[PDB]
Amino acid sequence: MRECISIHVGQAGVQIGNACWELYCLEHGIQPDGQMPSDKTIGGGDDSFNTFFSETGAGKHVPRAVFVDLEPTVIDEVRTGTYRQLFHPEQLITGKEDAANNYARGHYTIGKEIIDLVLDRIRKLADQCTGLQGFLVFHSFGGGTGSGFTSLLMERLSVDYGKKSKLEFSIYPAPQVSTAVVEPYNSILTTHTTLEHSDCAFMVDNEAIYDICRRNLDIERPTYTNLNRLISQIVSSITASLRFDGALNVDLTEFQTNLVPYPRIHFPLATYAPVISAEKAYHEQLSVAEITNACFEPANQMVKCDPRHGKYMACCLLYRGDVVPKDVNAAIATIKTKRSIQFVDWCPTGFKVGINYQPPTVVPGGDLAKVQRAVCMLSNTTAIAEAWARLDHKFDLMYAKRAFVHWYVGEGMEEGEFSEAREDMAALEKDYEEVGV
Amino acid sequence: MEVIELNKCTSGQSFEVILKPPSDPSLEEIQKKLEAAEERRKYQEAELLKHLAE
Amino acid sequence: MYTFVVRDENSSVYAEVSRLLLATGQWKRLRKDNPRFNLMLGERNRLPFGRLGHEPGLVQLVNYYRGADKLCRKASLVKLIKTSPELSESCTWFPESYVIYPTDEREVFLAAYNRRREGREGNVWIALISSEASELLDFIDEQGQVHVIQKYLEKPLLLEPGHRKFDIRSWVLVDHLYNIYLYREGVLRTSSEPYNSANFQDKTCHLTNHCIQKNYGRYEEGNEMFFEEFNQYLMDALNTTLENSILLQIKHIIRSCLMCIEPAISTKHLHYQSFQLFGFDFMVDEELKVWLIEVNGAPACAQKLYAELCQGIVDVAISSVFPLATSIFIKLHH
Amino acid sequence: REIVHIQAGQCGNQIGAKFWEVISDEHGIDPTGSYHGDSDLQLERINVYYNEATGNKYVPRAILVDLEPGTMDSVRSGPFGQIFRPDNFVFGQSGAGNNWAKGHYTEGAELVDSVLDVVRKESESCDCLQGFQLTHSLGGGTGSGMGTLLISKIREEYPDRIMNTFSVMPSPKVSDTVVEPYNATLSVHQLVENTDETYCIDNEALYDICFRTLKLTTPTYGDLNHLVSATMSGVTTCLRFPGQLNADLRKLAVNMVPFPRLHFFMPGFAPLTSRGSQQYRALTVPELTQQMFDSKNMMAACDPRHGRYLTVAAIFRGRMSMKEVDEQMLNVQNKNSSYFVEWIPNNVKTAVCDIPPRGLKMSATFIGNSTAIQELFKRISEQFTAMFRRKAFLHWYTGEGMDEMEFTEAESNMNDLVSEYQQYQDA
C-alpha cells in the first residue's frame, strides 16, 4: 500500500476538495468526526482506503490532504464547516492578500512568500508515508492563486520528490461562471510552466459542467455547489481504483502507462453518464448498453469537443454498480459498428475496463439521483486539443494589443514570458495535429 | 473480440478487450527566477518613489 | 435580429445569400472576427469548427459539415467507397478507381490493367486521358501531388444533334436535421465539339467543364442544357423520361453517399449545427446508366438558378433555425 | 481586507456624508452605530468599511478633511454626524478659495501632515489594508488640489495599495466659479498618474438627469447627491456584500483597466428616481437592462454610441431571476456588439445581490470603461483653452507660486489622454 497526498490550491481547488472529501467519507463510511466503524485495525492498516486517509490511535481518520489559498475566506469555511473535525489545522494554509486574478502575483510576488511554508507542511504528510506515490493537485486554470501558485508548487514538487507522480484536476475557464477577464492569460501561463511537471491532467471545462447541470439536472442557474457535486462524482470515479480493491489503475504510475503514451499529450478527456435529476419522479434505469453508448455523446463530456474528428491513443471505462463483463463487451461490439472510433496506427484499438460493484454514492439531499450503474470513460483523444485552440485564440486577441499585460509586468513578470508560454501552446497544438490528422 | 488479463475480486473485476491490433529545473534556477522578478519589482517601485521625490 | 459573418468572399453562392439575408432587415452583418454571431459562411480551408458553439446565449450554425471532405476529395472518395461496407467494392455506379502516390495501391491497379488488355476490351483511363499505363504513371510523378486513376467511360450517351458528350451536375442541400434536399433544377454542362472516340489528345470534346468550353454557345446558351429540354429530348429521341432513366439512379447515389457518412459528420447532438450545399457530378453512359464522377463541396451554381437556389438555402437551411416574424426541393427520404 | 475612506472639501464631504448615510441603512447601522437589522448578509463583510468597537459598535473607517470648518460642522450636526470617529475630523481655518494652487501648494501643504497621521492610525488597525477611496470635486480648491496632494503623498507611503476616487467633474450648468476648468485640468493630470480607478461623476450629466429625465425645474445640490449616493452604493456592492464574485479594489482594477492610464469609468444607474417621489411599480429585468445602458442614465455626460466599451461591470440588486438577468445581459452584447471591442473577449461581467437599496424593489448599477469618456475630458479642455489662450484669471495661481508651465503640461497630459482613448476606438 502506497499513499497519495491531495493538494487543493485556490478557490476552485479548495471548494472542489470539500466536495470530494465529503463524498469520499460517504463512500467509505466515515462520519464527520473522522470515525469509521469499519476500520477494525484501530490506528493503522495498509488497506486500500489508507492511500487517502491516515488513522490516529484516537480512532480518527484524517485526509492525506493540504488546503492552500492566498486569502482566508474560502478555507475558513473548511475550518468551521461540517467536516472541520476531519482536518487538523497544520493542513489548512491561508495567506493574507490573494493574487487579484493575477498569475504573476500568485507565482512571483505573493507566491514567493508562502511557498516555503507550504512545502514544509507537505513534508509533514510525506513523512507519515511508508511509500508515497505522489500527488493529486486540484486547481483552476483561471484564478490568480490557482494558476500562479500552483505552477510554482508544481516546479518545487519535482525537485523535492523527483521520483513521485503528479496528477492534475484542473478547472478550464468558461464565461458563464468566470471571475476575471484575464483567465485566458492565466491559463496559458500556468499550462506552460506546469506542462513538464505534470504526468496526467484531467481538465474539466466549467462550460460543460454548467450545461450538464442545466439540461440533465434541471437547475436553471447552476452555482459552484451544483457544479462541485457533479465534479466530485467524476473525481471519485477516477480515484476509486486507488481507494478500493482492484487490478486497474491501482497506483499513479498506471494512469500514465494506461492513458498517456506521449508525455506532452497528457490530457485525457473524461465522459460520464448517467446524470439523472434527484427530483425526477419516474425514472427508467439505464442499462449497461445505454450508459456506455452515452460515453460517446459530446453532451456528456467534461470538455465539449468532437472525438470523431481526432484519434484515440487509449481508453478506460470505469463502471460503478450492477455491471458484469459480459454486458460491457456486448455494448462495445454494437457501439464499434455504430460510431466513429479511430485509434492512432501505433496503438491497439481496445478498452481497458474496470468494474466496482458498489453503485455510485450520492450526497444525501443533493441534486443527483441514485442509480444502479454508472460509467466514467477516460479517453486520450486528440480531439481535446480544440479546447487549446479556443483558449489560445482568446489569448491571442488580447495579447495582440498587450491589453492588461501591465498588470503582470508590474509584478515582476517579463513581457517575453507571455510569448514563451504562447509558443509552447503553439507547439502542443501542433503535436496534437501530427498525432491526429 | 479478444478479452484478456481478467482479474476478479470480491469488490469488482477488471479486464482489457482488444478489437484490432496496431498497424527539470533545479532549486538554484528556481530561486534565481523568483529573485530576478523581485529585482524588477524593486527597480520599478524605486523609479516611482524617485519620481515622487522630484 | 439575427447576426452573421462572411468568411469566404470568393463564394458566388453565399455572396448572394448574404445579400438576401440583409434584405430582410432581420439579419445584421458583423465583421470577419466578431465571435458573437448566429451564422457563419465560413472559409474553405482550416474553418475553425473548434471555436463554434461556445458563445453562451448564442445559437451558432455554419454552412459546412466538418468531415465532409472525405466525400469531396477524389482520393478520399475512392478510399471511402472502397472501405465502407455500405458502398463496397461491388458498388455498381462508381467507376473502377485506384489511389496512386508519386515516387498506395499501384500494384493493384496494374492487376486490373492486364485483365483489360488480356480481354481485348476497352482500356482508357484518366487522372490526362490515355489508353496505356506507362504514360499515366509518368504524368503523376511529373506533377507532384496525389492523383486518382479511374476507368474512362468509353461509351457515353451522346446528344443529337452534334454527337456531343456531357455531364450532369446535381445540387444537393443537407440541413442541420440531416434532411437531404435535391434541387429540382439540374444542369447538363455539355461539350460543343462532337465527341471523338480515337484521339484522346484533344481534351476539348472529352472534358466538359464550363471553363474549357469557354463552338461554345452553338446549340444552347453557354453550353448549359437545363432539365426541361433534356427531358423533352429523351422523350423524343429515346422514348423515356429524365425521371425514369436517370433521376432514379441519381437520387439513389446521393442518398447512398450521404447516408454512408451521416454518423461521422452529423451535428444532431452537437453544440453547433451544420448545413452544407454539395455538387454531385454524374456521367450517363449509352445504356442509360448513371455513374458518379465526383462530389464537389464548394460548388457554384448556374447563372439562371442562383436566385432560386440561394433563396431555398435561406428557406430550408437558415430560417428553419432562425425563423423570421410549393418547394423547389425533392426530399430524399430515409 | 479593509478600505480607508477619505473625503476632501465641500463636495467631497457632502457626497461622502451621504454615502455613509446610505450604506449604513443598507447594513443595518443606526446613527448611534448600533446594529438593528434582520439579515446576516448585512454583517458578513461589514468589516470592509467599518471598524468594530466594544459594545458591538461599528464606526466607519472614514477620514474627514477640509480647509474651512463650515461644511464639516454641517456633517457633524447631520443625520449620521455622530457615527464618525471625532478624532478623524481634520480641518483648517483659511479655506482654499476655489483655488487649486492653495490646496496643492500653500494652504493645503500646511494641513496635509495632520491628515496622513490619521490615515496611518487607521492603516495600522487594518488586518490587511486593500487601499483607499477618496470622494472630492475637481473644480474647487480643497478637494481638487489638496485631494490630489493627499493622493500623491498616500501613494508615496503606500505605493502598493489601490487608490480609487469618486471625482465630481464641473459644468457651467452647475458652476461655482470660472476657474473650475483650470482646477479640473490640473487635477485630471494628477489622477491620470496616481489613481487606479476614478469614477467620473460629471455634474453636467447629473443636472441633465434632474432637469430632463426627472422633471425637476431647478435642481439643488441635494437633488444631485441623491443620484450620486445611489451610484456609489451600487458600484461598491460587490465589495460590501457576500456573493458569487466577492471582489475587492484590486480585482476591480485588474479586470477593468486594459492599460494603466485609461482608468476613467462612466457610472450608470436604473431606475432613475428623484427625492421623495416614491415609485410603486417595480421594473422588469428587461427594463433595468435597457435603461442602465441608455445615455439618459449615465452619470458622465458622454454618448456611449460615440465610442466603444473596453470593459463593463454590471450589478443587479433585488430578488430577481438570475437566469433572466444573464439572458438580458447577453442579449445587449449580442444585439449591439459593434459597441464592444472584440479584442477583449467576454468583457461584460454581471453580479447580483439580493439586498436592494432603500425604496426600490430592484435596481441596476453600471460601471463602464468606455472610450466615449473622452467627450468629458475634451469638453473640459475647450473650456480650459478658451481662458488660457488669454492667460485669463491666471493671476490667482501665479500669486501662489505657480508658473504657466504647469498649466501647459496638465493641458498636454489631458490631451494625450483623449488621444489615447481615441486610439482604441478605431482598433
Ligand SMILES: Nc1nc2c(ncn2[C@@H]2O[C@H](COP(=O)(O)OP(=O)(O)OP(=O)(O)O)[C@@H](O)[C@H]2O)c(=O)[nH]1
Ligand atoms: N467548478 C468550479 N469552478 C470554480 C469554483 N470556484 C472558482 N471557480 C472557477 O475558477 C476560476 C477563478 O479561479 P479561482 O479559483 O476562483 O481563483 P483563485 O485561484 O482563488 O485565485 P484568486 O484570484 O486569489 O481568488 C473561474 O474560471 C471560476 O469559474 C468552484 O467552486 N467550482
Ligand SMILES: Nc1ncnc2c1ncn2[C@@H]1O[C@H](COP(=O)(O)OP(=O)(O)CP(=O)(O)O)[C@@H](O)[C@H]1O
Ligand atoms: N471516368 C470518367 N469517364 C468519362 N469521363 C470522365 C471520367 N472522369 C472524368 N470525366 C470527364 O472529364 C471531366 C473531368 O472530371 P472531374 O470531375 O475530375 O473535373 P473537375 O475536377 O473540374 C469537377 P469538380 O467541380 O467536382 O472538381 C468531367 O467533367 C467529365 O466530362
Ligand SMILES: Nc1nc2c(ncn2[C@@H]2O[C@H](COP(=O)(O)OP(=O)(O)O)[C@@H](O)[C@H]2O)c(=O)[nH]1
Ligand atoms: N455634485 C456635487 N457637486 C458639488 C457639490 N459641492 C460642490 N460641488 C461642485 O464642486 C465644485 C466646487 O468645489 P467645492 O467642493 O465647493 O470646493 P472645495 O471645498 O475647495 O474642494 C463645483 O463644480 C461645484 O459644482 C455637491 O455637493 N455635489
Ligand SMILES: Cc1nc(N(C)c2ccc3c(ccn3C)c2)c2sccc2n1
Ligand atoms: C467591485 C466589482 N468588481 C468586479 N470585478 C472584479 C470584475 C469587473 C469586470 C470584469 C470581471 C470579469 C470580467 N470583467 C469584464 C470582474 C465586478 S464585476 C460586476 C460588478 C463588480 N464589482
Ligand SMILES: [Ca+2]
Ligand atoms: Ca486499518
Ligand SMILES: [Mg+2]
Ligand atoms: Mg481566491
Ligand SMILES: [Mg+2]
Ligand atoms: Mg464651494
